[PDB]
Amino acid sequence: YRYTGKLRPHYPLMPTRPVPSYIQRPDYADHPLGMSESEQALKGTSQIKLLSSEDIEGMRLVCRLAREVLDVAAGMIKPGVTTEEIDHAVHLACIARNCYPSPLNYYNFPKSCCTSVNEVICHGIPDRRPLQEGDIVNVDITLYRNGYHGDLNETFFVGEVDDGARKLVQTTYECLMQAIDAVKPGVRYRELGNIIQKHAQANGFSVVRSYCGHGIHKLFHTAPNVPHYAKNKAVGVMKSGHVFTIEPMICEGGWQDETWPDGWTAVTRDGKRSAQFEHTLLVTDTGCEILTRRLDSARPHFMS
Ligand SMILES: N[C@@H](CCC1CCCC1)P(=O)(O)O
Ligand SMILES: [Co+2]
Ligand SMILES: [Co+2]
Ligand SMILES: [K+]
User: Fold this and answer.
1) Are 225 and 234 in contact (CB under 8 A)?
2) For residue 37, what is the domain's CATH number?
3) Which residues of 213-244 are buried (b: 16+ CB within 10 A; e: fewer)?
4) Cα dist. 238→187, 188, 196, 244, 289 in Å?
5) Which of 28, 140, 216 to mutate to test the pocket of ligand 1 (most atoms within 8 A of CB)?
6) Which domain does 304 fall in, by range?
7) Sign of the C-alpha dihedral, residues 25, 28, 34, 39?
8) Beta pairing class for 288-290 and 279-283
9) Least enclosed by CB within 10 Å: which of 10, 15, 162, 288?
10) Cβ of 143 less than 6 Å from ligand 1
11) Is the shortest distance between the CB of 154 and ligand 1 below 6 Å?
């Protein structure tokens, strides 16, 4: 394997962290390949759950809890902290909230969150590497409570970063918020990518294509599939009671991605930097509720 940039995995990984048996698990948690019966059962489906009011309530609770766990992680972003240390903290913080860390053994993903540094687009596996001043780092959190999943991420600055870092991060967030702003009943899922790319390209950035936003509720990933790039073939129309994410990944250089031999880590083929943000959204009559929004601040962490 020829790595695309300067980052290398830092093994070995600390042994898998156990989840106390009292925590409710999703179906894949103890599958040996981390497969989810329920997700496969709807694989290739185009139909989109209309959540009931109790659904909506479970979704509100788990997304607020996931936000709380992300905020715990944000509080540890500093030079010299390892992504593995971040994950240990996240893992305890899920357990303390009585939630299962959704990423754990999801298709054998071996950690409880993703930490994606610099040229890692997404799904980085927490490891022994200490964070370096100048890095950017995304932490992606997903929790499971009472049959429901809630998913969010943000990109963070590690001490001081270069203007290009600042520009990529702010721009990515602006991409996400401009997309959310278009969310309301009657809007086509494919329109979101047009809005995202339009802003990305205007700032001299490219848009990752192999990874999409997705529906989420009782399933971790399900319809709709939501591409972040222009002129895409996404199927379906927003309707009050839909829940899904938008999570653009935006790049310095080219858009092309490839995967590390670990089977998970997605990096720029060109070794240049990528940033992402994610929210879990519910479509309401007037627009949408940002179920994973920060409550103690109007803004994401990087700009506070
Ligand atoms: N939370 C992230 C993916 C889910 C995890 C990636 C590694 C294991 C699951 P997302 O659905 O945003 O890509
Ligand atoms: Co997601
Ligand atoms: Co996520
Ligand atoms: K690399």
Assistant:
1) yes
2) 3.90.230.10
3) bbbbbbbbbbbbbbbbbbebebebebebbbbb
4) 5, 6, 17, 10, 13
5) 140
6) 1-304
7) negative
8) antiparallel
9) 15
10) no
11) no
Among the residues of 132-291, which ranges form H helices?
163-181, 191-202
**Nearest residue by C-alpha to atom 9 in ligand 1:** 103
Resolution value (Å, 1 decimal): 1.9
Q: What is the DSSP secondary structure assignment for residue 159, as one 8-state letter?
A: S
Give the position of tokens 């899920």: 94
For the chain, the residue count is 304
- Which atom of ligand 1 sits closest to the CA of residue 220? 11
Structural domain tally of the chain? Answer: 1
Helix (H, G, I), strand (E, B) or coil at 226: strand
Task: Note whether 252 and 122 are within 8 A (CB).
Answer: no
Angle, alpha carbons 28-108-148 (nearest 5°): 35
Breaks (C-N over 2.5 A) in the chain follow: none
- Which residues lie closer than 8 Å to 267 by C-beta, 6 or more apart? 3, 4, 5, 7, 119, 120, 121, 257, 258, 259, 260
Q: Decide if 87 contacts 109 (C-beta within 8 A).
A: no
* Tokens, residue 286: 């007037």
CA 58 distance to own-chain centroid: 19
Method: X-ray
